[model samples]
Structures are given as structure tokens and as C-alpha cells.
Target chain A: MLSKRLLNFESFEVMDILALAQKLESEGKKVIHLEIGEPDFNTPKPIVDEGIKSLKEGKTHYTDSRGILELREKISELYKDKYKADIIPDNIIITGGSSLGLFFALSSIIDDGDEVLIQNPCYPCYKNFIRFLGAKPVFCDFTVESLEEALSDKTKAIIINSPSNPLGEVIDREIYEFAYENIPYIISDEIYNGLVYEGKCYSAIEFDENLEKTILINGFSKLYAMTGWRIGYVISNDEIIEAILKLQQNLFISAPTISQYAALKAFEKETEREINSMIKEFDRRRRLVLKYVKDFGWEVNNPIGAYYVFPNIGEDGREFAYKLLKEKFVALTPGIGFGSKGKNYIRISYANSYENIKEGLERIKEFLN
Target chain B: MLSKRLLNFESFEVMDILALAQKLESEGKKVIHLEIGEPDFNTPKPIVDEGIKSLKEGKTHYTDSRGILELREKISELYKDKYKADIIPDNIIITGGSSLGLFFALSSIIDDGDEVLIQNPCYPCYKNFIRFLGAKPVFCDFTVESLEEALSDKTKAIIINSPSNPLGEVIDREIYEFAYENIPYIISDEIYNGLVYEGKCYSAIEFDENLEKTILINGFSKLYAMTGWRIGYVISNDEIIEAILKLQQNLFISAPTISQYAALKAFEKETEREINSMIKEFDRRRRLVLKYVKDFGWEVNNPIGAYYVFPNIGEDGREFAYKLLKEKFVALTPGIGFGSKGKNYIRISYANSYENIKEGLERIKEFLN
Candidate 1:
């Protein structure tokens, strides 16, 4: 019953394993969780406190459809701080999350049959939402071997999710500039920008002082670990922001008003410190996972930014993912779920605690041996 | 520049007035909000507490892109109770709000250039979003005298907003069925379903059982006074809902996580009583406003539901609204704001308290005299 447009759109393959995991938990079985991508931590006390305060203060009315002016100004300031990209409040459009921003961004520029280039093994929503609009999604398959063949005029824009999802491959400065020259507009999904595993981070805004073309998509989900808050934003040219706000006012009205207030406090210095420490934990776990993957003799991309670890499982990733589920009760997304090129790989998210990662890795090693 | 399609949208009129209102506010004059259509009441305590408690229990993760089974079931039960409609959980798609639901409802059913019939002086977004998607909105100019002459084959659907925004006009059972049977679908904006005062309450689902054809757009914004929550749902047959769910899964991911849990509590019997009391209050104010309009010799259609009182001003409403703002400091949406038929009318929202409504009505009386 899916839309003919969406009949081709792939479902999240990991949900089955996650469902099984939940079912087992309901039956009192101890299944390890690696399928869900959320941080284990609750939104810190300060953020939750802000929501309570707003509810008590009678903030139940509709906020400005784009957002309150103060929230927009704070988002602009965050762009300035992160990439030294000067932005006015008019240059930002806040949505329920970066996912919502992706929808608006595509709606802003995509006419029916217009194409958006997306990196393979990237966030699958890019393809799904693009097609949802009757627009085409052109895949620029990024491989450990090469990424040179992925550019064309049919590609109106490229959705760049640095610190990638299932694959967790962070692009360096050189690759960022090359792609920047190819597409007039680059929608940089920077939800995971602050979560680097070992080193430096490069942003699209940093490369271009002219902010008209590059759209930065980020949210408090990963950076501040406020997934449930559903607050994310698009920062770019004022005209585009205005265009998005017009659609958003109709399509969404605005992101949750209380979530916007809570996110305002999430960017303070102490919150930044907490986010950095969280990244540090991911890095420590990343090194351990890399060592074990080498021992298993699987070829995988180097762990970069984001919380996932993508490993090539050879020919059939779908079967391989299910096998791991049945044999080891470990859950991971098959890379083929991301794109056609990802057919031989599986993505394992390492966002869990060190203890869980250790137990998961031990099971995988035993199964491999 | 607005899109060529959006040039005729109703919000452009509101935008002009809003711009003027801001200018007046900047000059330190108090502009009474009559153009606004939201409730003045804070969201009920139980609904707000449900949101808070959900967050505390670590339910802040991404829900099923459709919505949680729990919330969907609640919505299904609501449909059963209200319309005796057997809406399955699978038949409902949760959205950011009714605006989003309306967009999806229009886009999913109406193809490019297909005509969607709507009453003139209706909720502005109805016309704008329809055109934005390349569908033609055939305005069936509704008047107190008759609606017989305004029917056509190109009319795929006629949008009915009872207890509507701007103008609180209700099409009673006779006209509603007459309009519905002619069109393949009835796009009912029943957001104000429980807020009726003049006409008895009605829902599209009450008359139609074809899930393939009927799309019921409703939300908690007005009913539960949870406007800031940005949560609503679209109810239809399992087939349409399934198709829209895939589109929604990609386009929105899901509605607010906290909102899904909170909305469940809003369906409780006690919350129904609290909502009904607000309707009683609107009834009291509607009576007072109807008397005032008659006293001033203005022609009006008494509102049945929704907190608005629309009156034909016998002049250009845009000009009338501005004059009222300048003369009485009481802002009102001019008839021209809704459509050509509304050019000689104005919509005054009575969502505020009785005292504010009384004072504002008195100020309006002085201006009219």
C-alpha cells in the first residue's frame, strides 16, 4: 500500500532485529542493544528543567511560526561560533529536527524530476524524501578506493552527512572542497559534526565565506544528546531561510516551542565540554573496535566521526546481518540498506557504553572464529 | 519574492496586516489580537504532565515514523467514540500538526491541475497549500443566502472547516452532504470539532465510510490547547494511511515523541469535560459578540464552533481592519483577508477570556458607531 513512489524506497532493515530484541526483552531475555542510535543518557537536568519552567510559565500558545526571534538569533550565533560564518536571524530556519530540515531543504530547491546527489551509505532519508517529492536522488557512491566518479549536472545538490550514519566515514578537507565545487548548493547534515573519533573536522561553511549556497543542517540530537527534544535547524542564506520558513509555517508551523528553549541552553560552554567528553568516550571505544575488526580480517573504512562502525561483510550483508542476529543476538544495519553499493557491508553503531561494546565485540569474534 | 503559485495565497494578506501590527506595536500602541485564532487557555495540566513524564522515562527516542502504537490506538478509539467510525490504528498518520496533515491529505489525493473545491473566506492555508502542490482550488463562494450555484465537476474535494478560523461559518448537515457526495473526497478541518456554539458539531467521518476517499484532519491545538506541542493526526482508510505513512516516515520521520505520549492522555474522559467547558465559555462570548454586531448594523453569520465571529463590514475588509486598528486599537482580520467574498467582512477570534472579548467588542462598537 506504499505510494508507487515509495514502493522502491527501502524500509529500515534493522527494525526487524530491533523488534525481535524488544520482544525478547519483553519475554525477559537479555538482548544487547546496538541497533538504536540514541545516546544512553537522558537529557541533562538543566534542559529538562527549562521545559518544566516553560510549561509552568504558560508557554502553551503558538510561538512565532518560524520560531521566537531570540531562538533564531541564538542559532545564528552558533553558526558564527562553529564556522565563523556570519549569519543573521533571518538566515536560520528551525524545524522539529535536522530530518525535518532535510525535507524543507529538498522542497525549497527540488522541482519534480530535479535531482539531488547523495553519498552512498549515507542517511537513507535523503533518497526517500527526495523521491517523496517526485525528485530524483543521484547517488555519488563513496568507496575506500575512490569517490571521483560521483558528479554531474543532473545533481542539483549533494546531501553531505559528515560523520556518517551506518558507515561513520568522515570526509577530510580535500574531499569537502572537491564536492563543494561540483554542486552549487551543499546540504551539510552536521548533526554529528562535534562527534569526531580521533581528529579534525571540516565544514562546508568554513570553505565558503559566501553563505548563499551552502546549507548547514544540525540539531541537538547528537551534539547535546537531546534526541527526544526533536529540535534541529537549517543555517544558510537569508533568502533560503525565508523560503523555508514560509513552507515550514505551513508544513510544520514550527518546531516544539519548549524544545527550542531547552536547546538554547544546550550550547553553553559547560554543555560543549560534556559533548566533547562524550566524543572522547566514542573515540576510546572506536580504537577497541578497530583492533577487533582487523583481527577478524574484515575490510572496513577507518573509524572517523559519528557513532557507527561500517565493516564489509563481503557478498550478502542482509543475510549476514540476520545471521548475526540469530546466532549472536547482536543487531546491526546491513550497508545494502543504505544504497546498492553498500550490498557487501554492515554498519554497527558503537554509541553504546564500553561494557556493552566489549560484550558485543566478544560475541562477534567468537562467531567469526 | 513569493512563488507565483503562492502569490494568491491568503497569508499574504495576513502578512501585510502583521507587518502593520508590528509597526504599530513598535510605536508602543497596544493592538488587540483579533486576527489571531488560537485559544488563550494554557494546555491542560495532565497533557503537559504526560509530556514531562514521557521525557523522564527515556521515551525521548525516535518513535515509529508513523507514531507509537499507543497513540495511534488512542486516536483510533477517538474516531470510534466521535463518529462511530471504525478507524484502525494503521489508518491514522500522526503529523506535526493539522497543517502538515492538510498538506499530506491534499498532495496524496489531488494530482496536478486537479481541482479541489473550497469555500471562500476559509482557512487561508487550505488554498495556499493546494496551489503550492500544483492543484487548483476552485473557490465555491459560500454566502449566508445560498451555496447552490457554486458546484463543478473539476471539484475533487471541498474543504470544510467548522468552527473555522477568520469566519466561523458552518455548513449544516444538508449542505455538507450535498458538497461531499459530489466530490470524491471531503477534506474536513475539524480542528475545532469540540468548540461549537451556534451549529451542532459534525465530522466528515460521520457521513463517509470510504477510507479511500475521506480524510479527517484534526489536532490538539484548539481542543486541548496544546498549540506549542505541534502534534496532530490524519485519519483515513488503511490504504491511504499506509501510503501517507511512508511519505510521512521520510518527510517528517515522526511527530513529536513527547507529544505522542501526551496526546494519549488528552483522549481521557476527564480531558473531554475540560475541553467542553472551554466550548461553553466560547458559547457565552459568541452570544455577546453576535449581539454587538447586530447593534452596529453589520451582517454576520453566527459561528457554531471554533472561536471566531465573522461579519460582513459593507466595505473593503482590509481597509476596514486597518481603520479599526488605527481608530480603536482593536485589530481584526478583514474579509478581503479570506477571499474576494470576504473583502467586505472581518473575522474576530473570541478565543480570549470573556472580559477581554467584552472589552474588545466594546471598543469595536465605539469604532463602528
Candidate 2:
């Protein structure tokens, strides 16, 4: 028998759509994927070359639990140059993936029954991780006014995902200030920090100058197209870093050594060129997705950043998702997986190629008519 | 502000010794390392070449949460050939490392307040992981007589590590039969399955042919000398595998893409030659350590397998460990870190070269005099 806690755990509902798509493909059907949350690009050549070099050099041993110092130092320099955030290597801890980093950031602080505030249509795992730690995930509207009402004595932290997953709504400076002032801790999920298409993206560090109360989570997966590398990082004050270090040492002895070494090339000039090209392609696809959502006559939260558009289809999302897959062979996430408020919404990702997005939209139009 | 559970978590004591040894090395002192548990050999050349090929081919994306089907199938075939275990691809789920695999296996079964019986002087993380889940880890002697006394209504599972860490003692068939008939679930840590020398190492599958109550954890780290590759796996019945699959999907997403592809070469003829050579070297070093332990008049369990020799040092293990490092510049694990019964013992790992092992033993003899 599994733990009772696992019963409370939910699978990423989008995976069901992926499984169906895979089944269809096996049966010689062409299906367009717009449901998965990974970049379609291969890892840039420079990083992959470096990974191969490290493996050949026999750099295949457990590194420090805090990760290799060179990678940590490079990350520090990255924040300084990009965000003007004066992060020292001591405040950073490299983790396996941003999800694990987020889990550890929360685990380092919350106690049983403590409440964590998350946006209603945010990433589902945020709520799941908080709940797994025996805490409460209080989902509230992302607006400042609605967030104020969700505050209570039991609230310990607030997780802010921007360039958010499904909604693609980036929080403003005012929201960061409000969250930092009210919540005991602010966990910033910035995995998609570098992929914004329109307005500027603000890191919590822009508000929390000394990183006194903000735990920033970012990784090489999105911007560098290195998802399979399984490398991410957390940056915060020394105390929290210390606590998470202990957890990482036990839970994961260390991140992959080859991956850590490869990530050192992530900030290089060659890799930067590849990243710019990929982001440019993503922006083009983003426009296509926005145009289709509008043509479909669905109400959508105008997505300014990230590669997704959450539209209110005004129908049961699960039913609509199944129908679209069955008829059009196009896969999109049912927003009900995010929360109850998203029951009538759907999340379409622009991570696929522009050709596939156009073809998927055409199929959806035919089905609707 | 950290969780209360972390307060009970202890650092791997051997790491502190490693840190001190590093400090001494930085000051121009030569320190022989006999404290770490990883193999001293690099990954086999075939595996390394395959890893490079994977990178060039752009196998850099999140694989199936269950893992790459080809790699899983290969693992399935390897088990059939080696253990005569009939395993289908669905019965296997690849993981990042065996440590994480062990953690997920326990999380899938034990609940809050469940009592888990573990051997005294065992892997330190076993108890910590069980405790992290709010379960009680009841440590007792590995003897069946002692295990029978530790049972209660709350006892949920028993973790059996053969070619056991620290002690290097492999269990017999009678023990497996007793455990299966008595315990609800058996977690078999077979990470050291390939390293046994004196007596043939037995897997729990030999007893539970259908794998009804056994959750077997194994990996490529020690056997193939691919620790940095961060790949491992879990095998069990459908219910347990299903539960762990959900956890893996949510927590890890998937293991490293390059590592998974490269591990396909692990069973090739060239890799087998390299593995046999490495094992032969390890056996030579093992014999060297045994001779010295006897020469020093230390009371040691006659270790039959793996690469460690646990000897009763007849003093406070922690104090003795520190003194030896400071005066002799030789590192070994303090037995107290394993459990209370290890208070008067010390664990010496022979994973170092025979020259270093001999030098470390000479230093230990001088320190005792």
C-alpha cells in the first residue's frame, strides 16, 4: 500500500493528453503537440560539446553538494550582468531541476498546517509540493487586492511564477513589493524568465535587493534548451541556502557532474547566439498562438510573456480537450488541471514549430465549424 | 525557519572528514583517501564513447517519465540474463540515482508513524529518509533472532542491504525467507550486487520470484563506475511501480538524456571486459585491507564482499576518527554515524588504490601505537 499522502498527490493531467498523442503517433497518425511544457529545441552545440568533454576527462564523480564552484561563480556573474543583482556564490545552490529546487525551498521553511498562497491559474505542482509537505496551499486571485484578503496567521510563504506557466502573466513591481511585505517568504519561479515576448520580465531580486526574503528558482532548461540536463539552482540568503544544502546532500548527493560542467558554457558568447535565435523563433510562434486564440472567439488573459495563452473556452475544459484531440489530433492542456477557477479554460503552448501551430489551429477551426 | 524534520537530519559524517582532508591537501600535505564509497575507476570507454555519440546526435530532451523505452528494455534484458528474473519493460522505472530511487520506493509505501526496521550499522540515509516521512526507523541487529523481536503492529517494511555498506556482509537465503514471511514489504538495496567476492550475493528476487513484496533498488554507479552519470532504477509489482512513476514524473521528470542513451552500452562485450578488470583490481585492494586489519589487531567482521572493512576499534569512534585524520592524514568513516552500535567501530573503504590503502593502513598502525 502506498502512503496516504501520495493519494492526495495528482498526476500532471497534461500527461494523459501526451499519452494519447503518443498512441496516435504509434498508429501512423500525425498529432501536433501543444500540451507539454518543454522546449522543442535541442540543447545548444557548445553546451553539449562541453558535456562530452567532461565525460571524456573523467569528470564523473560527486561534486560538492553546493555544486561545482565554477558554475556557482558563473551564475553569480550572470545575475550581476543581467539583473544587476549582486548575488555571491555563497547564496546559490545548484539543484537537479527547478521543481526539486522549489520543493526544497518550501521544505526548508514550512511546518505542518502552514498556509502558502499561490495564484489560482498557476502551475499545478506549486500547490502539490506545498501540500505534500503537510502545508496548505491557499489559491487566490493573482491581483494585489484579492491577495490581501487571502492573508492569514497561518500563511508562511507565497510562490510567484512569472511569465507564469498557463496564464503568462508577469507580476509587476507593485505586486512584488506587496508580496515581500506581507508574506514571510517569497519563492520566485523564474524558469521562464528569459522567454518573455513583449513587456519586460522582473525578477524578485529587482525588489528584494539583498535577497533577504526571496528564494529565486531558475534553471538552464528553458532559456538554454537544456531540459534533459536536469540542472537548476536556488538563490537566497545564507540561512536558507544552508538548510537546502543539507537537504540536497541527503536527497541528492549532487547534481550530475557532466551537466554542471556543461552549464559552465551556458554563459559563453557562442551559447548566447544560439539562445537569441531560439527566443526569436519562440516570439514568432507566440504571435501565431495569440492570433489563433482571438480568431477562435475565446476570452483569453492577454499573455505578454512565456510561450502560452490561457483562453476561457466557456465549456468544460476536459470535454473540449478530449473532443479536440479526437477530431483534430491536436493536444492542449485542460485548465481545470490548474484549479477550479480554470474549469472552463484551456492552455495552449507555442513550444511547437510555427508550421505545427498553424496546422493545429486550422484543424481546430474546422472542428468548431 | 527550516522544517522540524531537518533538525533531526545529520550530515554524512564522512563528508566532514573529506573536507578536512581537502584542507590539509590545500596546505601541501598528502592525504590518502579511504573514506568515500565510489569506485576508483572511470566509466568504461565504450560507455563514454556512446555518451559522446548521444550528444552529437542531439538526444537532449526529456525522455518518458518511465525513462527511454530502449534503455528500460535493455535493463529488462540484463536482469533476465543475470538474475534469471522475468521482468517486462513496464516493471522497470529508471531514476536519477539509486539514493533517490530508494527515497521514492519508501515514500510509495510507508505512511506517517509507520515503523520501518533497518539494520544497525547500515547506510545512514535509510533512517533519515524514513524519519523524513514521519515514520519511525526501528534499528536492530541484522540477525533473524533480533529482527523477530523488533516487530510490532506499526512495523510496515524492512530494508535489506546486501554487500552492505560499512560492514560488507552479505545475507543468506534463510534470512530472505524469514523476512518475506514476516515483513509486509522488503526494500532490497542491490547497488553493490556486482561487487561481491567471497560468497555469491543473493538478490531478493531469488526468493520472491514474482516480485510481489520486494522493491529492488539498483544502479550503474558502483558497478559501471558511472556515478556522475546519475542513472539508476527500481523494480517491483505494478502497484508500487505505478505509485513511484507518478512521483518520478512530478519530482524528476526524467533522468539525463545522454546518460540514459550511453548506459545502453553498459552490457556490451567491451564494457564487460572493463568491468571485469576493475572488479579484479578491487578484489586485490580488498585483500590488502584485510591483511592490515588483522595485523593491527582490530576486531573486524570478516567482510566477504563489497569494498569496506568495519573494525571494532575499542574506543569512541568519532574521537578516534578525528585523531587519525589530524595525526596520520588518513581518512575513514566513524561508525557512530551509521547507528549507536557503531560507536566503538570504524569503517575503512578500500576504494582507493592498493598503494594508498597500504599507506593509510600503515599510518593507522602508527597512530594506534
Candidate 3:
């Protein structure tokens, strides 16, 4: 028998939609994707050129397991410049994605039955990561009305996804400070940091100088539109970074060398305009979703940061998602996939083009009304 | 407090020598490396081309958590031809390497304090992984004189690294069946399956049909000389693969899409010739090391596959390794790093040129004399 750690556990619910979308695409249906969570922009020409150059130069060999010093140095600079935080290159561990970072971070810290708190309706993998490590994920169910009411002594760590997933919510500094007061650790999934359309995003590293206990998870997938590259990073005090680095050396050895090289180029190159353009695009769709929700008599959580919106779908999100998929050939991820609180909610990602959003919204509007 | 599982743990001894070699190289010494255990070849051109093509054509994106179908199908066909094991593509979970496969295998199976029997002087990661997962790694010392005497009832699984690292010893078929009779599972680390220097390399899967508990961990890194490209896979019966795929999905998402594409190309191409030529070179060097051992009155384990030699230094392995490094600037790994029986022994890799090995060996002979 397999270990009970994974027997009944699940992986990410949002990313699972990619398979459904691909299946639909294979069957020749015009499926407008609102369930995908990555930007549609192609990698910049220079980054691609650098990747090709690395391949041609025979750079395909194992790098040091912590990752290349050059990439780590670049990340250090990026963090320092953005957050005014002093980060040593040694304090960074490059990973395949924020997902990998989350895995390593949780694995290093969680013992069996150890409790980690996560904001409900956040990244599904956060919960899965806890479960995978044989740790129980205690949900600090954050609502607009009672967001701060979720901290506890049993919470070994808490995950704060500012401009959060599913609902596009951004957390204020007060919440992080409150989390720091009660928990020994905090894992900030700042992958959606720069994706904020509502306000300036400061990394969790800014509020907590207790670096030993706070871990920051981010990657180029969201910021540089390099989702396929699978490059993510973990930043914390040297002790935690070192522990995670050792674990990473054993588990992965190192992230792809060329991806690190390409990411090095990604940091050096100017991406503000390109990313801003995508954020602007998502903002437009955010408006569309809001209008449709009001017109269709549906309620949505505050959609402030990420490329997603969690909307209340009467009393059954599964039925709502099923209806959308069947009646209109459009798909949605049910909120119940996240947790019990999400039973009446559905998450709609806004990463699709305006045309797809237009079509998907119309389908949802028709189905709901 | 850290877990009691790691209270007495240490990282691999080989890693220390590699680090020392790195330090020497950084200090401007032209060190001849007989310590690193990877192929000296750059990734093949066509494989690099596939990765470059993907990067250029905007194929940089996250894959299905299980892995891309193209690469999985290639692995399936490769398994059929090489191992003659009938495997479905669905039964495969693409991983970062055999290390992660071991990790997922152990994590998906073992609960805290579950005793896993491991062959000593084996892959250090196997023991490390076992301990890290809160499982006890009970060492079963296997030697040429007593290969079959290492099975125990508490041994939930036995890790078989045929064409093994460090010692490069490959156990025979009878031993595995013996293990099968007693042990509930066999985790075969056959990553070096194709690097057989002399006799035919047979997989445990080839002899057993009751695969309810056998896992075949193999990958393209060694077979195709694509180490940095980081593509490997795990093959097991559906019961195990399904659980691992779920973890892979949540943990890594997938291996590099471009690396997977190149791996597909690697399977179709005659990459084994490259591996064979390298093995032939290692075989010749193996003769040199054996001759050197006899000439210098050193005790050594004769390896059958892979590219390493384990030689006893008549003193503590750590002390002996340091003495070699100090007297001749020749880097070598202490065997005790693998397990208890490896004490007073050192692992010397011949992944470099025969010229380097000859020079390093001559230095050792002179220094000892």
C-alpha cells in the first residue's frame, strides 16, 4: 500500500484545467480558455536567442545544485532594487517554478502532523504541498470582513499570496505583521507580485526582517512570461536557504542550466512595458467579468491582484462549472476544489485574450441567466 | 527542533571531494579530476538542437504535470527495445532524475520510522532520502564475497543500483529474486543500466512479472550524455506510477519541455554508441586502476559497470582522501561517506581522460610509497 500521506491527497486544481483545455482543443472545439493561469505572450526574442546560444555553446552540463552564481546574483540585484532588501546570493535557491520552491520550503520545515496555515482559495498546491510532507494544512480562511481573524498558535507558518489567487485580492502590510506576530514562519507566494493592477506590490521580505522564519516564493513564469521554462526561486535567511538547498541538491540536483541562462537574460532585459501591457489587458477583462457578474446577479470576491476572479455561483460551483463546460464548450474550475468554503464559488482565470474573455463571458452570462 | 531522523545524518562523502577539487581549481591548480561521477561529454548536438528549437519556437511553457506525451511515448518504446519490459506510457512518470524517482518512491510509500533496507556503499541519496523521509535506512553491506547475505525482514525495500555508482558493482539476477522472496519491494536505481562495461545488464523487471512492487528508475542523462538537460523517468506498475505522477504534477509540474523533446530525439538516435565508447574508455581505465592497486599493495573492489573504483587506503577513508589531496592535489572520495563498511576506502572516478587518471594514479603510487 502507498503511504497514507498521498492516498487521498490531490494536486493543483487550477493547473488541472490545462489538460481539459488541451483535450477540448484536440477534439476540434473552439474552447475559449479562462481556466488557464499563464500569460499568452511569447518569450522575448533576446531571451530565446540567449537560450539558443547556450545550446550551441555546449552549456548542457550539471551546474552547482544551488544554481549558477550568475543567476543567483541577478536575483539578488532584482530583489535588492525592488524591495530595498539586502539579499545575498547565498540566500537564494533556484527551482523549476514557484511550485518547486513551495515543495522544498514546506518539505524542509514540516514534520509529520506539523500545522501550516494557508489562505483559503489560494494556490491549490500549497495545501497539496503540506499534505505531501505529511503536514496538516490549517486553513486561515481570509475573507474581506474577517481576514485577520485566522491567525493561531498552532500555525507553524502561514502563506500569504498578496493580490491573491482566484479572487485577485491584495494583502495589506497589517495582515503580514499580524501573521508574523503569531507564527514562527511565513511563506509568501509572490509569483503574482508584479501582476497587480490595483496597487504597488511590495514583497513580503520588506515587512519582515526576521528572514530566518519568512520565505519568499516567486518565479519568472508569471513575470517574464516563461511559464514553460519552469524556473522559480526561494529567498530567505541563509539558514533556511541552506537547508532547502541541501534538499534540492538531493531531489533535483539543479534546475535546467539553459533556463537559468535565459532567466539571467530575462532580468537584464527591460520587461516593464510588456508586462504592463498584459496587466492592462487583464484589467480590461476584470472589468468585463465584473460587469457580467452584476448583470447576471452573481457575487465576486475582490479581484485586485492576480489574473483570476472567484465568483459565487449560487450554491453549487460544480454544477456551475459543469453547465459552463457542457452548455457553452467553455470550462471553469469549481471553488469546492479549493476547500469547503469554496463550494458555492468558481474561479475564472483572465489570462486569455480579450476575444476569448469576450466569448467566455458571454457563454457564462447566458448559462447563468 | 530538527527531526531525530537526521540527528546522525551526513551528506555524501564524494560531495566533499568534489567540493575540495572545486576549491583547488578555483585556487589555480590544474587538478586532474578522478572524483566527479558524470559523463565528460557535452550534451549531444541534436539533443541540444531540440531544446534550442523549443526555446526559439516559443515552446517555453509548463507541461502536463505527468509530462509531455511525446517524451513518455519515446521512453515507452526505448524500454521495450532495451529492457524488453512491456510498459505502457501511462505507467511512466518523467522526473528530474533517478534521485527524485527514489524520493517519490520512498515518499509515496514509507511512513515515519518505516525501516528500509539499503545496500551499503550504494547511492548516498538512497540512504539520505530514506532518512529525510523519516524512514530508517538499515544498511545491508553487500560485497563480492557475500552478495546474497544482505536481506532482512524489516527491509521493506532493497535499493539495487546496477552498474552502481562509487563501487560500480552490478549484482546478479539470483540476488534480486532472493530479495523478491523476502522484501516487499525492490527500488532498482538502474540509471546506469546502459553503462555496462562487461557482462549483459539485466533489469529486475525483466525477471519478474509480479510488478506490484518493482520500480524501474532510468533516464536519458547517463544513456544520452544529457546531464544538464535533466530528463529521467520512473516506470512501475499502475499502482505506483499513479501516485508518483500525482506528486510529480504537484511538485515539479514536469521536466523541461525542450529537454523532453531532445530525449525523444535521443531515443531514436544511436546515442548508445556514445555511451558505449565512454564505457569502453572507463573499462580501460578500470584495468589501470586495478593494476595500480596491485602494484601499490592497495585493496580494491573490482567494478563491473559504471565508471568508478572503490579502493581501501589502510586508514580512515576521510584521512586517506585528505592525504591524497594534500600530497598530490589529486581529489578522491572517502567510502565511509556511502556507509559504515566503506570506511578506510576511497572512491576514485575515471570519468575524465585516461591520461588524467594515469597521472593521478601515478601520484597516488608515489605518495603512498
User: Scored by CA lDDT, what does every candidate get?
Assistant: 0.76, 0.89, 0.77
Going through the candidates in order, what fraction of the true interface contacts does each contain?
0.51, 0.73, 0.69
| Tens digits of lDDT, candidate 3, B129-227 | 888777788777654335345544445677788877777888877768777766788888888887777778878877665467788788877767777
Classify candidate 2 by CAPRI docking class.
medium
Residue B261, candidate 2: how far off, in angstroms?
0.6
Write one digit per residue (lDDT tens) for candidate 1, span B1-369: 222443443445777678878888899987777767788887877787877787777666778878889888888887777667787787777888888888877766666667777777777777778877677877766542344565555556778887577667666787566766565777788888877765457787878866666788998888889888888889888767776776677667788788888888897777877877877787888888888888888898656667788887788888877777877777777777677778778888877778877888899778766
Q: Where does model 2 exceed 4 Å of error?
A: none
Residue-wise lDDT of candidate 3 within A88-192, one digit each (tens)? Answer: 888888886788898777766667777877777667777887876667787756543354555445556778887777678887777777767666888898888
Which residue pairs clash in candidate 3? Answer: A96-A230, A163-A169, A163-A170, A164-A169, A168-A304, A168-A305, A228-B60, A228-B61, A228-B62
Candidate DockQ values, in order, are: 0.50, 0.79, 0.65
Provide backbone clash counts, one per model: 10, 0, 9
Q: What ranking of all candidate models by lDDT puts the best one first?
A: 2, 3, 1
TM-score of each: 0.93, 0.98, 0.94
Docking class of 1: medium
Q: Considering summed lDDT, which 10 consecutive residues are worst modelled in model 1 chain A?
A: A1-10
lDDT (Cα, tens digit) per residue for candidate 1, span A277-315: 777888888888888888888888677878788888676
Please give, as one word, the docking class of candidate 3.
medium
By summed lDDT, the worst window of 10 consecutive residues in model 3 chain B runs over: B1-10
**Candidate 2 residue A314 C-alpha distance from true site, Å:** 2.4
Best by DockQ: 2
